[PDB]
Amino acid sequence: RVFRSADVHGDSFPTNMAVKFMGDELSKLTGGKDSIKVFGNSALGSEKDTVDQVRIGAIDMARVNGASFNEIVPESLIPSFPFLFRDVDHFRKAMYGPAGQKILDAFAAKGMIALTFYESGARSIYAKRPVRTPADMKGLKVRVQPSDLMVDEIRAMGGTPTPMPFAEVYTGLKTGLVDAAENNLPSYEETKHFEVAPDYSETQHAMTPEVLVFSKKIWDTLSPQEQAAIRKAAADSVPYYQKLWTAREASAQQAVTKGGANILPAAQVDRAAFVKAMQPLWTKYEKTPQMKQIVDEIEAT
Ligand SMILES: O=C(O)[C@H]1O[C@@H](O)[C@H](O)[C@@H](O)[C@@H]1O
Ligand SMILES: [Mg+2]
């Protein structure tokens, strides 16, 4: 059948392109039985809404950010932990290894099959002034995703967090409802947030993954061969995504800079001040010995 899949991003964005690529591959692996259509631009709803729809089987699939599972799948909190990953190479090795697998496995009890992660770079604060330390965060109305952890992260940085859906952030910034948010460079560019919040400060406070989830209610009706085809197509989409994403990080940085944005390099941001402030949250959100073990497996990579 045609599986319906949700994404907040536009059609040309790397996540949408990767799932469309998966769909093309899936078609061939199933003798034309299956394909995927990606409804971008938050057409099917916010991330929160589309996750609830995937869980009841109203839509087949969604490519969403890991933060959107933080109140549903406890293990999803872990890779949103602040300053957990040293760098992108660390994220890749740990998240496409056994530790990442344990996180994927936890989705199944919550009515989702987590097929793969996709990298999402590092999230950084942007605003109408640069931010080198927490003092600089004070008084900023900072949009966050609707995640208790993300609320706590921004509060710990010194800002005042306000949860909002991704599609609404641009209007929020343009009209002063909020005056800052945080994200990777491709998202900063795609949404035009860089036009109204031109100071992008590389706090690199989180390296939250994307997750591609499939509705378990729909999954449970498929044969093992069909399931295996879907899993292979998802796995095969990752190097395709990585080529697009690495190129997009670079082109986004150049595009926003040419479009007037000022990037404060990570080296000039008081990483020390932010690590001080944010570090206790790990212990707050380790709600089981299994979560502690996953964190340890990531750190040991
Ligand atoms: O901040 C957000 O809501 C967005 O952040 C982006 O990095 C993720 O790609 C997107 O899935 C999230 O919806
Ligand atoms: Mg430990």
Swiss-Prot record:
Pfam family for this entry, one: DctP
Q: Which UniProt keywords apply?
A: Periplasm, Signal, Sugar transport, Transport
Q: Which residues are noted in the entry as beta-D-galacturonate-binding?
A: 9, 47, 63, 123, 183, 210
A single GO BP term for this record reads: transmembrane transport
Which residues are recorded as binding beta-D-glucuronate? 9, 47, 63, 123, 183, 210
Q: Mind telling me which GO cellular component terms the entry cites?
A: outer membrane-bounded periplasmic space
Q: Which CDD domains match?
A: PBP2_TRAP_SBP_like_3 (cd13671)
Q: Which InterPro entries match?
A: DctP_fam, TRAP_DctP, TRAP_DctP_sf
Domain of life the protein comes from? Bacteria
Q: Where in the cell is it found?
A: Periplasm
Q: Which GO terms describe its molecular function?
A: carbohydrate binding
Subunit text: The complex is comprised of an extracytoplasmic solute-binding protein and a heteromeric permease formed by two transmembrane proteins.
Membership in a protein family: Belongs to the bacterial solute-binding protein 7 family.
The record's PANTHER family line, in alphabetical order, gives: DICARBOXYLATE-BINDING PERIPLASMIC PROTEIN, PTHR33376
- Function statement: Solute-binding protein that binds D-galacturonate and D-glucuronate (in vitro). Probably part of a tripartite ATP-independent periplasmic (TRAP) transport system that mediates solute transport into the cytoplasm.
Protein name per Swiss-Prot or TrEMBL? Solute-binding protein Bamb_6123
Q: Which organism is it from?
A: Burkholderia ambifaria (strain ATCC BAA-244 / DSM 16087 / CCUG 44356 / LMG 19182 / AMMD)
The root-end lineage is: Bacteria, Pseudomonadati, Pseudomonadota, Betaproteobacteria, Burkholderiales
